[PDB]
Design a protein around this nucleic acid. Structure first.
Lengths: 46, 93, 73, 56, 77, 136
RNA sequence: UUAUUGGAGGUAGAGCACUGUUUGGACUUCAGACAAACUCCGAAUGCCAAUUAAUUUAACUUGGGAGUCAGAACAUGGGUGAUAAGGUCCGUGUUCGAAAGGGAAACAGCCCAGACCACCAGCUAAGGUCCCAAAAUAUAUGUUAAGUGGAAAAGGAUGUGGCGUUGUGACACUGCGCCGAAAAUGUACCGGGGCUAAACAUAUUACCGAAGCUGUGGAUUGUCCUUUG
RNA sequence: CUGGGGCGGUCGCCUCCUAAAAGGUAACGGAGGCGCUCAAAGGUUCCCUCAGAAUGGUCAUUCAUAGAGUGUAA
RNA sequence: GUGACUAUAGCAAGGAGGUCACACCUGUUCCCAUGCCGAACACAGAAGUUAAGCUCCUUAGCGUCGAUGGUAGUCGAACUUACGUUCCGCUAGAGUAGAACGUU
């Protein structure tokens, strides 16, 4: 299991860490997580 | 049948019963189709010879304060070690 | 045995629930009543506030009932 | 002022809860006595120690 | 001749933490446990690990839930 | 000899031998029997001596019942060892016997034959017993 | 510490309803058994409380100062060992450690009991009263003949007493005895003499007996003021 | 560490029993596991009820607190 | 109808109750639905029927509650290697309750 950071797509922050897999989900993810610096729900990648 | 169930009354102790059974006496209770639910004594030599002769599952009259009550013999406790009875239940009909 | 089954679902909705606007459907009649939850006491009664859906599906008949009491105040 | 109590046996070699009880009756030395009133609770402290005291 | 035993866990202090009839403050823990040996009553709540805590500062009283189960309720003082 | 087919645990604490019996005190399969009066461990390897003796003295004209059964194993260490470093390996199967427990029973036999037979059994058993008959 | 009430919890015990183990039949089922890692059940105690009552007088906090981190035996619940060890490891208690005095002959830990000091005073404690050696050759009733008392089993056996059941014979339980019972310097398993009562079982008294308690005098710490005594 | 030391084993976390019904509790005492895995095996909202037998030829029915399942030990 | 209640409520057996309430019952026209099935879910409804459900009354076959007395087990104490006193007091088992109490 590989350990990934979630940089956001409007706010450039890198403000979440999660655990993906490298075979079951072997593709760069998206999320709707709370960007704090923007005070919003926003799309996170990486 | 021929039993004089001398009422034990008050409340027993460890030594009261250890001394009863040490002598020729045996504890028993009376209940059944009677409102009494008494706690009485027996002489073992008298119960042994009464239920050796009145059969195995017959009837018995018990003189709890002279009132013979037509008791059965429902239960009892026993020592096969000491060859001797420890307690008797007297149903009454 | 539908009224035996409806009760079971009902029990699984009234653990986190409670005044109740309890309901009870039938082949043709609706029975609703607002009952309280600390004395064992009922307040109102009309035949044919947290909403107890009785164990039925919230849909149609019970839907049409509960959505008219919203404009009842 | 009934029940003149006297500690007739020592509290050496006795367990410590017993040591506690006998000095909660207020007994200091051996043969040291007291006269307490019969509570229902004071009566239960001289069941805990029946052996080391002599009530009367 | 060596063996392949000799290892245990660490005992986790696990049991009743307040007594029936005691005054509790509104966040105290009332019972720790693996799975519900006792249920949350009134004014009481269970968290992850199922530990029972009192929401409001009242009296704690252990009660019966049917024939078998049990429960921890917190009346108001 | 006689022993459990499986056991969930091959090494066990040893059983209490203080107390009186909690069963087997009444002759129920047979007509007679042998009632212990001393506490001990009775082992499979000597139940298979007592049974042999009783079976043959009755000339194969009767019926024997063995009430007790060896459930528990006991473990012993090898020959010359120090203390510690594990628990020894299994050595045999025992059964704890307390005062009152009927050990054997017999039927299809006369009183004198059964008396002499159960006499000749208890000389191979580490407990003092007494001949007991079926009760009232 | 106690009384009372409330509570949580699964031990001893017991039981087979679960999991295993198991006997005998019947043909799943009757009857009977085993369990630290089984539970339909379930004590005694101990534990937590009330803001409850009663006796007592400790408790906590914040500071300065330490020592300890080799524990031992005894009773008891267990593991291990071999139901070995004055063994080893843990729960609970006591004593020694750090504790003198009396008894256990002698003997840290066993039973009694906690020494401020003096006394040629009295009362008791464990334990004892024939002599060594302080005080009963006390008292009432029985048992034992082995010097049992005053080291030990399986098993044997017209020892002997009690009590009950039995057809002068036979039996279950029992009290006390016999055999089984062989080691090295010297009797040598009562401390010794000695004992047939100076041994046992049950009950009455008397007394001896400690540095315990009391009496008297004294010395230092305290707290209450009867009357600073 | 060590029933002298060497050799053998172990060394950290989790679950049982030992553990003496609160909690804690030792030994080179008795059994095992861990050094992860899930983007749905999370949240929520709705619905649903098992295992095995007897019956017949995965399917249907009666019986079936409860013996299944719960990722993974207990 | 809907709460409380430790099956003394249950499992069971019989027997009796019709649309005024409770169903079964009639069909998909839509609301909505079946990893297929208006079976269920839900929508429109009166017929035909208590047969079944349900409820009301009777039975102690199983289920459950269960005394008393004694026994085991111990707290404590005192002789000592397991008996003796005092208190607390089980399991199992026989006597029994029992075919439900009860609000709004």
């Amino acid at each position: 299991r590989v350990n990934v950071t979630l940089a956001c797509t409007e706010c450039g922050d890198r403000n979440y860490i999660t655990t993906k897999n490298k075979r079951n989900n072997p593709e760069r993810v998206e999320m709707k997580k709370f960007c704090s610096r923007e005070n919003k729900q926003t799309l996170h990648r990486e | 049948a021929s039993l004089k169930s001398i009422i034990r009354q008050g409340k027993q102790t460890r030594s009261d019963l250890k001394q009863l059974r040490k002598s020729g006496k045996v504890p028993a209770v009376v209940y059944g189709y009677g409102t009494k639910n008494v706690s009485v004594k027996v002489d073992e030599v008298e119960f042994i010879k009464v239920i050796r002769e009145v059969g195995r599952n017959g009837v018995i009259e018990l003189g709890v304060g002279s009132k013979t009550i037509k008791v059965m013999v429902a239960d009892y406790q026993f020592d096969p070690l000491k060859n001797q009875i420890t307690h008797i239940d007297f149903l009454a009909i | 045995d539908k009224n035996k089954v409806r009760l079971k679902r009902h029990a699984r909705v009234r653990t986190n629930l409670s005044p109740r606007l309890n309901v009870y459907r039938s082949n043709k009649h609706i029975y609703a009543q607002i009952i309280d939850d600390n004395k064992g006491v009922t307040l109102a009664q009309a035949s044919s506030i947290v909403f107890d859906r009785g164990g039925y599906l919230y849909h149609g008949r019970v839907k049409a009932l509960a959505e008219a009491a919203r404009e009842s105040g | 002022a009934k029940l003149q109590i006297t500690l007739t046996r020592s509290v050496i070699g006795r367990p410590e809860t017993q040591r506690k009880t006998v000095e909660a009756l207020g007994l200091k030395k051996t043969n040291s006595s007291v006269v307490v009133e019969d509570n229902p609770a004071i009566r239960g402290q001289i069941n805990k120690v029946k052996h080391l005291v002599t009530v009367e | 001749s060596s063996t392949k035993n000799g290892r245990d866990s660490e005992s986790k202090r696990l049991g009743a933490k307040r007594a029936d009839g005691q005054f509790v403050t509104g966040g105290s823990i009332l019972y720790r446990q693996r799975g519900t040996k006792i249920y949350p009553g009134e004014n009481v709540g269970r968290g992850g690990d199922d530990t029972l805590f009192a929401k409001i500062d009242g009296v704690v009283k252990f009660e019966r839930k049917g024939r078998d189960k049990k429960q921890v309720s917190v009346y108001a003082v | 000899m006689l022993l459990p087919k499986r056991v969930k645990y091959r090494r066990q604490h040893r059983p209490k031998t203080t107390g009186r019996s909690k069963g087997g005190n009444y002759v129920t399969f047979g007509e007679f029997g042998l009632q212990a009066t001393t506490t001990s461990w009775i082992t499979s390897r000597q139940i298979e001596s007592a049974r042999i003796a009783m079976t043959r003295y009755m000339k194969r004209g009767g019926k024997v019942w063995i009430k007790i059964f060896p459930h528990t194993p006991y473990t012993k260490k090898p020959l010359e060892v120090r203390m510690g470093a594990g628990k020894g390996a299994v050595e045999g199967w025992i059964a704890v016997v307390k005062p009152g427990r009927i050990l054997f029973e017999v039927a299809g036999v006369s009183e004198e034959v059964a008396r002499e037979a159960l006499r000749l059994a208890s000389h191979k058993l580490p407990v003092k017993t007494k001949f007991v008959k079926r009760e009232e």
